[PDB]
Amino acid sequence: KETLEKFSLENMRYVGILKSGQKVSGFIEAEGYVYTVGVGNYLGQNYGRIESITDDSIVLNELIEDSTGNWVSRKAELLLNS
Amino acid sequence: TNIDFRKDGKNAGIIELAALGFAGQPDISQQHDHIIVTLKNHTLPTTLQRSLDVADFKTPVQKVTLKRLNNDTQLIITTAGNWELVNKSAAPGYFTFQVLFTGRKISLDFQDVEIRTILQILAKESGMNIVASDSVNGKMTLSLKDVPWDQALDLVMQARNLDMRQQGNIVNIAPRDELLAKDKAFLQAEKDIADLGALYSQNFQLKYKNVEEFRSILRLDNADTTGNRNTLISGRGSVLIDPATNTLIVTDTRSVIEKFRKLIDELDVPAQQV
Amino acid sequence: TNIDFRKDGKNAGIIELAALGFAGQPDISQQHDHIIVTLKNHTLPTTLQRSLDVADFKTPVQKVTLKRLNNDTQLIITTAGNWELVNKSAAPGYFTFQVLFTGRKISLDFQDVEIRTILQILAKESGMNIVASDSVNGKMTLSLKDVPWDQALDLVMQARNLDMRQQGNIVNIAPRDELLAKDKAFLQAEKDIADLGALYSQNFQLKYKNVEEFRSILRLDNADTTGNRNTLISGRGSVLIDPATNTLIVTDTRSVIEKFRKLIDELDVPAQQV
Amino acid sequence: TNIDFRKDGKNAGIIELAALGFAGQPDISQQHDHIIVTLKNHTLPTTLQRSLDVADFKTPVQKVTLKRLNNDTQLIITTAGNWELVNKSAAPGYFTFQVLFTGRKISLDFQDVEIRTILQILAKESGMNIVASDSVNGKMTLSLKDVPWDQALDLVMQARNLDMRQQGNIVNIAPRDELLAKDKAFLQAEKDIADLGALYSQNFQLKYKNVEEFRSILRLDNADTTGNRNTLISGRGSVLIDPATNTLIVTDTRSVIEKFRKLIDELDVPAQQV
Amino acid sequence: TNIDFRKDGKNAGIIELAALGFAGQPDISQQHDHIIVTLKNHTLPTTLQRSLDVADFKTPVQKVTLKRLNNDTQLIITTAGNWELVNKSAAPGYFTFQVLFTGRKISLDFQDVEIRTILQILAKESGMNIVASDSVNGKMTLSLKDVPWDQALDLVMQARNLDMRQQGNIVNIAPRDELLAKDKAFLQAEKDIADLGALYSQNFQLKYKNVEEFRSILRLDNADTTGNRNTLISGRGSVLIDPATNTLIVTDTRSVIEKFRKLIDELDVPAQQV
Amino acid sequence: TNIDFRKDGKNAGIIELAALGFAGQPDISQQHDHIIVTLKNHTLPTTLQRSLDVADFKTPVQKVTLKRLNNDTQLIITTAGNWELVNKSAAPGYFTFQVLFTGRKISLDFQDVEIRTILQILAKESGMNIVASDSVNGKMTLSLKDVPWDQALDLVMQARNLDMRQQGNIVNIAPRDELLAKDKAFLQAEKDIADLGALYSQNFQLKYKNVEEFRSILRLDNADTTGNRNTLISGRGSVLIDPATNTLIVTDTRSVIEKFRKLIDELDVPAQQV
């Protein structure tokens, strides 16, 4: 996928935003590494996938092993941590 | 009884409270504004209800405040933004609270970044070639959406940032700013009155003589530092700008501005005797 | 004894009261103005009758107020608009109170919406094409009925909103407003006197020279920011408007207005010597 | 002991009194002015004789007042107009008091009705065609007898209502009123001095130039709002009226009036140099 | 009970506290701001809560502050930058806290070094040949990055350092500085008013006579010390500089400047009678 | 209890403390700033915490300060520079603390030596032939490095030393100094205002007459002492100097200067009537 596959999710948080006109995208960062995400993108440690963004918050959905011991999706919104 | 504050983990506001003579646990009330902690049979004296001053500590805890209750001990821990409360009991008596001018449209989100970097980023954006002086300011945080970089730049300047001058291909931005230079100077000054002072901007009309002729002299006086030839000059942010309608605008400390005005008017007067 | 406040659920005003030494239940009196809670044999000291300051907390509870009674403890919880009271007893002693210029006629109902959106909505209404600057203001709430959008717009502007300028096809609305820019500036200023200050509007008569000729210079001084060419300009909401009867109206901070006046009058005078 | 107030039923003023240590019943004395309640052996402390502030609560109870007696507890419940007293004892100790310009002659009785409706009603009365602006004011209550609608209208205007301007067939009435706009503004102002301020009316004589010529400019400055063309204008109730003997009357805030005067006099002066 | 401060090891801030009547150990709370030490059953009198004044002691401990708690003894040891806390118990009662103008771009990092050395270093850098006077100032600490040596030099001068004059091949830098000479003088003066005083700079215009002609006399008065011939002169940092547009700039104490002005103007006047 | 100070050995600062009611030994804390001595169960009254005033005693002990502690007796013995502490117990109760203008470049290190000697030393250095008056001043301590003797001389003069006049082969240096003569005079004066006074220097322009002509008269008035013929004169350090551009500079007490000015101006005026 991308370098991000070398960072965890604990170190991944909302550090900034980034829009153009009205697309409004969310800018996240992991252990210094800066990587943005918009409607339908990739993030998180395992297999993160964002669906929508919002003011001071973003709605994503990753894929991590759990509830069985095998990769499994998981939606969740983050609250801008400034 | 007594209260204490400390930071740990990652920008977390810990509130170590000393409870001498308590057995069970107090009533923790996590509110959206502040926190509440009541301790039955723990009435503390007004000589121990001291408050904290952890302001600008980069933590979720605005400031700790202790207040003696009727028969109990109420605690007020002001907070800000989203946060989480975590109580810890390392022993029967010790309580703790871990509080954890035309351009393309762009959205500018810079979180705690140097203005210089923001300057570069914009340039990279194909927004001109912006080159700052060396030590213009510091770091700033702005978040904008749907704004052209040129507009955002102006907004950025106002926030605490610098003013911009453009050569044309390359733009130089300098710390020529009312607030920072003087604000710091104010704090520096011992006298309270000095705390009030100002760098100001004034426009000098030049009726008789051409503005450019003044440049040599103005540059010289402006350089109250070593500098072979600089339009921008030291003396901590003094600047002279030449408008097209032959007027000079000077931005700087009052003392420096006074000097510049005296010279400009002085030269103008002899031009005046026609 | 002691009182506490907190928000939960959905914009609900909770009032957690600490009752130490009580068995039964107090007398809850839900009034249309405030609330009343008496606790027999619960007389609290004046050192615990502290009041709350939950103002502008977006809740039905205006503010909590504690007062010591003769032999009991009376409580005053001011409220607003329609609401409901809900008492909860998590234990024998802990009490809680969950307080839960010509256009078509239109009715404008905007509840807590950005002015920008209201601007767009009106335009969508076939009311001109309104384009704001970028960061004009914030969100506002108005509710009107039987008012033409043009009229409502003016009313909207006054509420806290912006002033409007029309190009003709498209209209630009900007934060050029007396109250917001300065109000915030006042709060920003440390000095109390500074709290009183003002952006003001003044009309400059131009007898000798044409108004348009001034435009180049005025635009330049107005841009105390980078901007290749903008009629509206930075410097936080300074604006120059040209009326038909060759007068200039400037709206902005006093300092900026002073500068503009000096230049305008200055140019006018030489025009004057005919 | 303690007193409390609350509304219920249909605009009824209930006075819940807390009587701790009482057996029988007090002495209820219903007077045409206020109420009296004595409680033998119920002497309450001065720290519980607090009074109420239920002013303008739309109830028969003016305001509740508690006063400690020699050995008893006297209560004063001021009232107004015709009413009835109703005591209720929900228990041995808790006391309650349920306090429950030429026209045809017309009698105008409007009880708590919008001025706008009264405006319509009069028009329906064959009294002209009156059309208000949109948000002129609010609701008002007047009761008159044997008065022509035209006269009543003037009286109505004075009460709190608007001033009227007549096109001829249709009449427009606007909130151009000294009291409401400013009164609210006063309250809005934080400064006490601001509480004193005024919208005023002034007459401007125009010696040299015709009044109508001014109209274009005055309309423009008056519109400190968007409006293609309105004789009446925004800026919260500023108005210019043209009398026949070529004088202008302006009614509005002092600031706005000042602006208008400056322009009018300014134009008049050049007319003056003949 | 009592508190004490002392330095040891290598720039370490030790805080020896006297605990009379204690057995176990207090609660050490190492915070990022200050320190906290509570001693149960060690409540100290307000007559022993004296604070320390170890300011500018070149230690990690800003200043020690003692405060009496309700029933315990709280201690506040303000600190700065990164540091480490180390408690030591030499006995059951004695507590201790060991708190442990165009040039190439260069980054100037000088930690506590004499300005003179920095002067030499820059010269070695191929930045001119800089020669100071003898006793220009003292040592200073600056850290810069990405700045041309010429620019850094100006910044360096401002910090507390000197002003520079260039012969051309060699540059002489002197203590001609507003702040140091006078600041020290202020402290020297017994009178409080004297504490406020100033060395100032002023520009003298010379209309009638050539600036150089003045040099002989000015040099002489300037030398209120023995000196056969020095452009720079004693009298503790008085200097006269000749600008190209035949104006003289003098930097020095007010008294000295006054003298110089009187002479300059005096000579100019006879030149004036043409 | 009580404290005492005394000098012994070789410039040593002894601090004899009286401890009545003590058995063991206090806690000696030798700090880089001051000293600390705690005496458990030795709490002394505030009427015995008197401090010492051994200022300028030429000892390592700045000044002794006694302060009563909660239950003990803390002692503060401020010190300076490098020193050593030595406690001595002559008996169970008595405590003691033994606190033990162009020339060659030269480094001038003079430790507590007469200025006169420094004057001679420099001359011996091949620095001119310097001859002072008789009683110029006293002794002074300076330490310089890398400074030409001529420069050091000027610095030396400023420290407290004299001003220099050169005949050419031989140089005479005199106590003509603002600070010493007047400073002593100030102390001498009983009146506080007198404590503020000054010897000042002023420059007298001589337009009409030659400076030398004045010499006879000025010498005479200057000699308010017996002296057949002296350019330098008594009256405690009054001096007249003749500059080349025919101006007279006088340095002395205000009274004497006033007299001299009156005469100079007086003679000049008749020269003036041409």
Residue numbers in the entry:
A (entry chain N): 84 to 165
B (entry chain B), C (entry chain C), D (entry chain D), E (entry chain A), F (entry chain L): 226 to 325, 343 to 516
Quote the authors verbatim.
The secretins are a large and diverse family of integral outer membrane (OM) proteins which comprise key components of the type II and type III secretion systems, as well as the biogenesis systems for type IV pili and filamentous bacteriophage. Our previous work on PilQ from Neisseria meningitidis showed a dodecameric structure, with a chamber sealed at both ends. Other proteins seem to play a more direct structural role: PilP is a lipoprotein which binds to PilQ and is essential for type IV pilus (TFP) formation. PilP thus forms a link between the OM, through its interaction with PilQ, and the inner membrane components of the type pilus biogenesis system.
In order to generate a structure which would allow docking of the domain structures presented above, we determined a 3D reconstruction of the complete PilQ dodecamer by cryoelectron microscopy. The final structure, measuring 155 Å in height and 110 Å at its widest external extent, forms a shell around a large internal chamber. The chamber is sealed at both ends, and a cut-away view shows evidence for distinct and separate structures within the density map (marked on the right hand side of Figure 6A). Structures of the B2 domain (B2PilQ224–329) and N0/N1 double domain (N0N1PilQ343–545) were docked into the cryoelectron density map using MULTIFIT, a program which has been shown to work well for structures with multiple components, even with low resolution maps. A striking feature of the resulting assembly is the location of the C-terminal helix in the N1 domain, which is orientated vertically, lining the sides of the top of the chamber and presumably forming a link to the transmembrane domain at the C-terminus. We therefore propose that the first β-domain adopts a partially folded structure in the PilQ oligomer, sufficient to contribute some density to the map, but have omitted it from our model as it remains poorly defined at present. PilP projects outward from the assembled PilQ complex, in an orientation which is different from the T2SS GspD-GspC complex: in that case, GspC was placed closer towards the interior of the secretin chamber. It is also readily apparent that the PilP C-terminal domain lies close to the B2 domain, essentially sandwiched as a ‘wedge’ between the N0 and B2 domains. One obvious function of PilP, therefore, is to stabilize the PilQ oligomer during secretion, preventing disassociation and consequent disruption of the channel.
